[PDB]
Design a binder for this molecule. Sequence first.
Ligand SMILES: CCCCNC(=O)N1CCN(C(=O)c2cccs2)CC1
Length: 121
Amino acid sequence: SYDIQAWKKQCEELLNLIFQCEDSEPFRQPVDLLEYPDYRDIIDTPMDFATVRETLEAGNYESPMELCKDVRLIFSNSKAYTPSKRSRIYSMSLRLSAFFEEHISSVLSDYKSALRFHKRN
Ligand SMILES: CCCCNC(=O)N1CCN(C(=O)c2cccs2)CC1
């Protein structure tokens, strides 16, 4: 399965599934500072799923590794902003992360295999 471009539609598909998940609701749009005015004192680089989807559709990811780095930043930002492990929004981030990781693993493997096949000779 050596299609070097297949990861893009696979990532679009996976973002559609993440948008259907009720657990994505807090992460679907950039954090609002009016409710969280301290947010940028804690978080250096905000990230959200709408920004990831727009970056993909603009043609501004070169690989699924780059997309994966931004999605992982959504989750590390939640983990750094939470005052406790027993946070509703943090617990939503941890279920959504498990779902994402379960689905992205084949996307990454197939892409990396395709690149290795391209440079086989
Ligand atoms: C505009 C619609 C929602 C935008 N998101 C939003 O406001 N937040 C989700 C991300 N976040 C957190 O990860 C945590 C809050 C408490 C524990 S972690 C801060 C709040």
